[PDB]
Amino acid sequence: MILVFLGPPGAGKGTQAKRLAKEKGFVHISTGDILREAVQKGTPLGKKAKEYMERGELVPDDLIIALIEEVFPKHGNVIFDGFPRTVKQAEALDEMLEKKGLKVDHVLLFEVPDEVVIERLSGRRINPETGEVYHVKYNPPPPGVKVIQKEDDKPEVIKKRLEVYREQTAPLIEYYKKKGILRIIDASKPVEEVYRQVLEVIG
Ligand SMILES: Nc1ncnc2c1ncn2[C@@H]1O[C@H](COP(=O)(O)OP(=O)(O)O)[C@@H](O)[C@H]1O
Ligand SMILES: Nc1ncnc2c1ncn2[C@@H]1O[C@H](COP(=O)(O)OP(=O)(O)O)[C@@H](O)[C@H]1O
């Protein structure tokens, strides 16, 4: 099974992807996590992607498409989490899969209002070492666990990221709807409730 998680930043896509991958045996492909590792290591990809990420812009398509070609699991179930982010990327994904006799089985759209998005992101805190994600209100980190607020989770960059999502990424909703594989998730609900719906639509 191949899944794509789609939705505004802060919808809880990474949270649900980690849970589902761990519990039901999927390989989790997070372009965000992979890019952040590239940046930390200072690879050619990391050094180029960094400035786009910092401004809240998308990293150029060719770089992301090559990344996916490099890391795509040959066998097994896969959750694509944060990819594709543009129509060009979605078309590239379809081509790659078609050549391998595969396809995207379900696209899950994590619906959540803008006001909730902003609250999700402004309260997001991460363990900079482990990448573990917390929220100051809805899932506070234990004391004596070092966390930070990511620079791209500050108000100005959040605004930019939502604009970029609406302009470049939201068209994928219609792209996948017309393939007949789109499923709607109410991602505004608490974590366990969202996870139950995730399990429902793929069962
Ligand atoms: N598929 C992609 N195409 C272009 N840029 C990406 C992609 N995935 C991640 N990025 C870059 O990494 C940043 C953070 O990505 P991600 O971790 O998926 O988002 P979020 O902050 O919503 O959890 C994005 O704002 C973008 O700059
Ligand atoms: N259902 C939920 N209710 C409240 N907070 C959530 C929920 N899901 C995730 N979060 C928190 O919201 C923020 C965004 O979650 P994340 O998984 O990083 O979103 P995305 O990957 O879609 O950008 C994180 O701080 C996370 O702890």
From Swiss-Prot:
ATP binds at residues 10-15, 120, 124, 133-134, 189. It catalyses: AMP + ATP = 2 ADP. Its EC number is 2.7.4.3. This is Adenylate kinase. Monomer. One of its GO terms (cellular component) is cytoplasm. Belongs to the adenylate kinase family. It is an enzyme of class 2 (transferase). The lineage of its organism: Bacteria, Pseudomonadati, Aquificota, Aquificia, Aquificales. Pathway: Purine metabolism; AMP biosynthesis via salvage pathway; AMP from ADP: step 1/1. Keywords: ATP-binding, Cytoplasm, Kinase, Nucleotide biosynthesis, Nucleotide-binding, Transferase. Residues 30-59 are annotated as: NMP. AMP binds at residues 31, 57-59, 82-85, 89, 161. Pfam families: ADK (PF00406). NCBIfam families: adk, PRK00279.1-2, PRK00279.1-3, PRK14527.1. GO terms for biological process: AMP salvage; nucleoside diphosphate metabolic process; nucleoside monophosphate metabolic process. Catalyzes the reversible transfer of the terminal phosphate group between ATP and AMP. Plays an important role in cellular energy homeostasis and in adenine nucleotide metabolism. It comes from Aquifex aeolicus (strain VF5). SUPFAM superfamilies: Microbial and mitochondrial ADK, insert 'zinc finger' domain, P-loop containing nucleoside triphosphate hydrolases. Residues 123-153 are annotated as: LID. The gene is adk. GO terms for molecular function: adenylate kinase activity; ATP binding; nucleoside diphosphate kinase activity.
